[PDB]
Design a protein around this ligand. Sequence first.
Ligand SMILES: CSc1cnccc1CC(=O)N1CCC[C@H](C(N)=O)C1
Ligand SMILES: [Zn+2]
Length: 139
Amino acid sequence: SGAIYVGNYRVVNRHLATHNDWANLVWEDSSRDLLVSSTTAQGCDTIARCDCQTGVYYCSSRRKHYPVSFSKPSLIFVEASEYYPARYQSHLMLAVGHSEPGDCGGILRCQHGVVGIVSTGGNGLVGFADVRDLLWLDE
Ligand SMILES: CSc1cnccc1CC(=O)N1CCC[C@H](C(N)=O)C1
Ligand SMILES: [Zn+2]
């Protein structure tokens, strides 16, 4: 579980999106595992507009924040699940770190703000869905 609350938007993993999210849909992309819904309240999460490759992510399976080196956003192949068949997920960034299935939605942050959210993982690796290219979240 976990979401980004910026302005009148709620950013979540598409596979973990609720009924309310689909009823207040703004934009969704299965290949990125992202879904954006609208909110009445005004969020204050600052989104990073950078090319940082180091940050800190929240791991709910350990109740700890971990510092990570992470890769540039790219097309990384992801194995089949009850949410998506086997495919290439775009705008994905990998880091060496701990993750479990309940960890999806944890925020990744740098000195510039919110980079993205936990989306994939396994084998000692953790994947983050980047949100820095989504410029419309601010405007
Ligand atoms: C941190 S998630 C995780 C971590 N360890 C083992 C397993 C996982 C689960 C996992 O990777 N995914 C299942 C749910 C959808 C995901 C996606 N974005 O396509 C992929
Ligand atoms: Zn940054």
